[PDB]
Write an enzyme that holds these catalytic residues in place. Structure first.
Site, PDB file in Angstrom:
ATOM      1  N   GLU A  71       0.824  -1.188   0.000  1.00  0.00           N
ATOM      2  CA  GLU A  71       0.000   0.000   0.000  1.00  0.00           C
ATOM      3  C   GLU A  71       0.853   1.229   0.000  1.00  0.00           C
ATOM      4  O   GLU A  71       2.022   1.085   0.403  1.00  0.00           O
ATOM      5  CB  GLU A  71      -0.832  -0.131   1.251  1.00  0.00           C
ATOM      6  CG  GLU A  71      -0.122   0.122   2.574  1.00  0.00           C
ATOM      7  CD  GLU A  71      -1.175   0.477   3.583  1.00  0.00           C
ATOM      8  OE1 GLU A  71      -1.693   1.612   3.449  1.00  0.00           O
ATOM      9  OE2 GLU A  71      -1.520  -0.366   4.397  1.00  0.00           O
ATOM     10  N   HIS A 100     -10.593   4.558   2.552  1.00  0.00           N
ATOM     11  CA  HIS A 100      -9.952   3.854   3.650  1.00  0.00           C
ATOM     12  C   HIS A 100     -10.175   2.342   3.667  1.00  0.00           C
ATOM     13  O   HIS A 100     -10.563   1.593   4.616  1.00  0.00           O
ATOM     14  CB  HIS A 100     -10.372   4.464   5.003  1.00  0.00           C
ATOM     15  CG  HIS A 100      -9.276   5.266   5.637  1.00  0.00           C
ATOM     16  ND1 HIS A 100      -9.362   6.636   5.799  1.00  0.00           N
ATOM     17  CD2 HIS A 100      -8.095   4.843   6.163  1.00  0.00           C
ATOM     18  CE1 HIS A 100      -8.269   7.100   6.403  1.00  0.00           C
ATOM     19  NE2 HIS A 100      -7.521   6.014   6.602  1.00  0.00           N
TER      20      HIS A 100
END
Length: 108
Positions: A71, A100
Protein backbone atom coordinates in the site's frame (compact mmCIF):
# COMPACT_ATOMS: atom_id res chain seq x y z
CA UNK A 1 7.06 14.87 -5.88
CA UNK A 2 5.27 11.91 -7.63
CA UNK A 3 2.16 11.25 -5.47
CA UNK A 4 -0.95 10.93 -7.72
CA UNK A 5 -2.77 7.73 -8.72
CA UNK A 6 -1.49 7.67 -12.34
CA UNK A 7 2.02 8.96 -11.55
CA UNK A 8 2.64 6.37 -8.87
CA UNK A 9 0.81 3.61 -10.77
CA UNK A 10 2.96 4.15 -13.84
CA UNK A 11 6.17 4.56 -11.85
CA UNK A 12 5.62 1.13 -10.13
CA UNK A 13 4.82 -0.76 -13.38
CA UNK A 14 7.99 0.65 -14.96
CA UNK A 15 10.67 1.01 -12.24
CA UNK A 16 9.15 -1.78 -10.07
CA UNK A 17 9.55 0.29 -6.87
CA UNK A 18 7.97 3.40 -5.28
CA UNK A 19 9.24 6.89 -6.10
CA UNK A 20 11.97 8.15 -3.61
CA UNK A 21 9.50 10.35 -1.77
CA UNK A 22 8.01 7.34 0.12
CA UNK A 23 9.02 5.86 3.52
CA UNK A 24 7.40 3.17 5.57
CA UNK A 25 5.39 3.52 8.78
CA UNK A 26 8.55 2.43 10.64
CA UNK A 27 10.91 4.73 8.95
CA UNK A 28 8.54 7.61 9.71
CA UNK A 29 8.29 6.63 13.40
CA UNK A 30 12.10 6.49 13.84
CA UNK A 31 12.21 10.03 12.43
CA UNK A 32 9.75 11.22 14.99
CA UNK A 33 6.38 10.97 13.19
CA UNK A 34 3.56 10.90 15.76
CA UNK A 35 0.29 9.88 14.03
CA UNK A 36 -1.85 11.79 16.64
CA UNK A 37 -0.14 15.11 15.87
CA UNK A 38 -0.21 14.81 12.05
CA UNK A 39 3.42 16.09 11.85
CA UNK A 40 4.87 13.92 9.03
CA UNK A 41 5.63 17.09 6.99
CA UNK A 42 7.53 18.59 9.89
CA UNK A 43 9.67 15.55 10.48
CA UNK A 44 10.15 14.10 6.92
CA UNK A 45 9.45 17.05 4.67
CA UNK A 46 8.34 16.04 1.18
CA UNK A 47 7.65 12.39 2.11
CA UNK A 48 4.56 10.22 2.12
CA UNK A 49 3.94 6.91 3.94
CA UNK A 50 4.22 3.93 1.53
CA UNK A 51 5.71 0.49 0.93
CA UNK A 52 4.20 -1.50 3.78
CA UNK A 53 2.47 -4.81 3.20
CA UNK A 54 -1.29 -4.73 3.33
CA UNK A 55 -2.60 -8.00 4.78
CA UNK A 56 -5.82 -8.29 2.60
CA UNK A 57 -7.48 -9.61 5.76
CA UNK A 58 -11.08 -8.95 4.55
CA UNK A 59 -10.26 -10.87 1.28
CA UNK A 60 -11.41 -8.05 -1.07
CA UNK A 61 -8.26 -7.85 -3.26
CA UNK A 62 -7.54 -10.84 -5.54
CA UNK A 63 -5.52 -13.62 -4.06
CA UNK A 64 -2.98 -15.80 -5.91
CA UNK A 65 -0.26 -17.86 -4.24
CA UNK A 66 3.04 -15.96 -4.07
CA UNK A 67 1.26 -12.68 -4.33
CA UNK A 68 1.76 -10.07 -1.68
CA UNK A 69 -0.06 -6.76 -1.50
CA UNK A 70 1.62 -3.39 -0.72
CA UNK A 71 0.00 0.00 0.00
CA UNK A 72 1.12 3.65 -0.51
CA UNK A 73 -0.55 6.91 0.36
CA UNK A 74 -1.89 9.14 -2.46
CA UNK A 75 -2.42 12.96 -2.56
CA UNK A 76 -0.52 13.64 0.64
CA UNK A 77 1.35 16.86 1.16
CA UNK A 78 1.03 17.77 4.91
CA UNK A 79 -1.20 17.25 7.95
CA UNK A 80 -3.00 14.06 8.95
CA UNK A 81 -3.08 11.14 6.43
CA UNK A 82 -6.12 11.04 4.09
CA UNK A 83 -8.14 8.03 2.83
CA UNK A 84 -6.44 7.69 -0.54
CA UNK A 85 -4.23 4.66 -1.12
CA UNK A 86 -2.68 2.78 -4.04
CA UNK A 87 -2.64 -1.08 -3.59
CA UNK A 88 -0.05 -2.93 -5.76
CA UNK A 89 0.65 -6.64 -5.97
CA UNK A 90 3.96 -8.47 -6.48
CA UNK A 91 2.65 -9.20 -9.98
CA UNK A 92 1.95 -5.51 -10.57
CA UNK A 93 -1.86 -5.42 -10.32
CA UNK A 94 -2.87 -1.81 -9.23
CA UNK A 95 -5.95 -0.87 -7.32
CA UNK A 96 -7.16 2.32 -5.75
CA UNK A 97 -9.22 3.03 -2.62
CA UNK A 98 -10.36 6.54 -1.63
CA UNK A 99 -12.50 5.29 1.32
CA UNK A 100 -9.95 3.85 3.65
CA UNK A 101 -9.72 0.30 2.23
CA UNK A 102 -13.51 -0.11 2.32
CA UNK A 103 -13.79 -0.68 -1.46
CA UNK A 104 -11.33 -0.89 -4.33
CA UNK A 105 -11.27 -0.37 -8.13
CA UNK A 106 -8.72 -1.57 -10.69
CA UNK A 107 -6.54 1.17 -12.20
CA UNK A 108 -3.84 -0.88 -13.95
Amino acid sequence: VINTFDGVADYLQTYHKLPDNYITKSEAQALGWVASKGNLADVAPGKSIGGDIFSNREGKLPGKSGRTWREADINFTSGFRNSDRILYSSDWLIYKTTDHYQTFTKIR
